[PDB]
Amino acid sequence: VSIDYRHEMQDGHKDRLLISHRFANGFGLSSEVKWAQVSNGTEVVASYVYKFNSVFSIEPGFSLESGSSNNNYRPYLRGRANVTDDLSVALRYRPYFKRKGYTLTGNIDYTFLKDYTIGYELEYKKGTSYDITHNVKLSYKWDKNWKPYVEVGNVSRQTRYRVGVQYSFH
Ligand SMILES: CCCCCCCCOCCOCCOCCOCCO
Ligand SMILES: CCCCCCCCOCCOCCOCCOCCO
Ligand SMILES: CCCCCCCCOCCOCCOCCOCCO
Ligand SMILES: CCCCCCCCOCCOCCOCCOCCO
Ligand SMILES: CCCCCCCCOCCOCCOCCOCCO
Ligand SMILES: CCCCCCCC
Ligand SMILES: CCCCCCCC
Ligand SMILES: CCCCCCCC
């Protein structure tokens, strides 16, 4: 189980608290509460990660969000390839049916010096009623329980900044 708090600003603000767990069988569940300045929301996600082998995995997922402004059903399929022990790549297709469109999100993540991770995320969003996002995240496993992190992204025009920390139970 982990609990992840994150603050976001551009150049109002957004905050979130995301609690999640992935079981050794592959089943995962998360619940997130979000507030922004006012709006609020909650999201729940259930998924299975199915590992074909040490390199390739596929993760179908189900999510519903309920809010002031965002209210969507967003199922998804995420494929992952471990290129090396330190380097992974993923691609996620996530349509949204909200009150429709889809996002396509690619991720490249590289772990170095045991405790650091640098991640690049490219996200393409297209409505049916496009935007491209570039994001860089840097995380540091400070100890067995705490993983602070920062993200800087460009949303296309403007910059989106996040700071957060993930606490893991042991
Ligand atoms: C939701 C904020 C980000 C996740 C941190 C909450 C984890 C709760 O377990 C904390 C146990 O270790 C902390 C011991 O120090 C107590 C500090 O109390 C603040 C907890 O909210
Ligand atoms: C395995 C299928 C999907 C798992 C969903 C689990 C969540 C079920 O909880 C429903 C109970 O509602 C609690 C309070 O409702 C607040 C609104 O919920 C936010 C998103 O629906
Ligand atoms: C992006 C569309 C293709 C991805 C598969 C659809 C996922 C939504 O499935 C709906 C069923 O919801 C229940 C699933 O909850 C258990 C976790 O397993 C994920 C399978 O959906
Ligand atoms: C790893 C398996 C799961 C990954 C998703 C499976 C299928 C994804 O289809 C993508 C749908 O978009 C079609 C065109 O792709 C456009 C790529 O981005 C450039 C924008 O034109
Ligand atoms: C081992 C690979 C993983 C590390 C990759 C991290 C660095 C990747 O940086 C690419 C991010 O590109 C950001 C582009 O910024 C958008 C510029 O938009 C114009 C300014 O408004
Ligand atoms: C099992 C720990 C995550 C909690 C998710 C709650 C879903 C309603
Ligand atoms: C993995 C079984 C379901 C866990 C749900 C925890 C309470 C909402
Ligand atoms: C301490 C040097 C500044 C690092 C800048 C990083 C900007 C993304």
Residue indicated by tokens 């602070």:
148
**CB pairs under 8 A, 24+ apart, for 22-28?**
22/49, 26/50, 26/51, 28/61
Residue reference for tokens 């619940």: 31
Contacts 24+ apart (CB under 8 A), 159-164: 159/10, 159/11, 160/8, 160/9, 160/10, 160/135, 161/8, 161/9, 161/10, 161/11, 162/6, 162/7, 162/8, 162/137, 163/6, 163/7, 164/4, 164/5, 164/6, 164/7
Q: Which of 97, 106, 155, 99 is nearest to 128 (CA)?
A: 97
Cβ–ligand 7 distance for 29 under 6 Å, the answer: yes
Amino acid at 167: Y
- 143, 160 in Cβ contact below 8 A? no
Instruction: Return the structure tokens found at 25.
Output: 């069988």
The strand ranges marked E within 86-130 are 87-98, 101-112, 116-127
Is the minimum distance from the CB of 19 to ligand 7 under 6 angstroms? no
* CB distance 19 to ligand 6 below 6 Å: yes
Nearest-angstrom CA–CA distance, 32 and 73: 15
DSSP lists the bridge partners of residue 81 as 56, 89
Between CA 136 and CA 119 the distance in angstroms is 6
Burial (CB < 10 A; 0-12, 13-18, 19+), residue 53, is exposed
CA-closest residue to ligand 5 atom 7: 120
* DSSP secondary structure letter of residue 32: E
Atom of ligand 6 nearest to the CA of 30: 5
Domain boundaries in the chain? 1-170
Where do we find the tokens 């949204």? 96
Q: Which ligand 4 atom lies nearest to the CA of residue 93?
A: 5
1-170 CATH, one of 2.120.10.70, 3.30.950.10, 3.40.50.10380, 2.40.160.40? 2.40.160.40
Buried b (16+ CB within 10 A) or exposed e, 131-154: eebebebebebeeeeebebebebe
- Say if ligand 7 is within 6 A of residue 122 CB: no
Place of tokens 């995240």: 137
Å resolution of this model? 1.9
Residues in CB range of 53: below 8 A, 6 or more apart: none
Residue at token pair 């905050």: 15
Tokens of 48: 């299975």
Does 1 sit in the ligand 2 pocket, CB within 6 Å? no
Q: Give the closest residue (by CA) to ligand 3 atom 1.
A: 76
Atom of ligand 3 nearest to the CA of 77: 4
Q: Report the structure determination method.
A: X-ray
Ligand 5 atom with least separation from CA of 87: 1
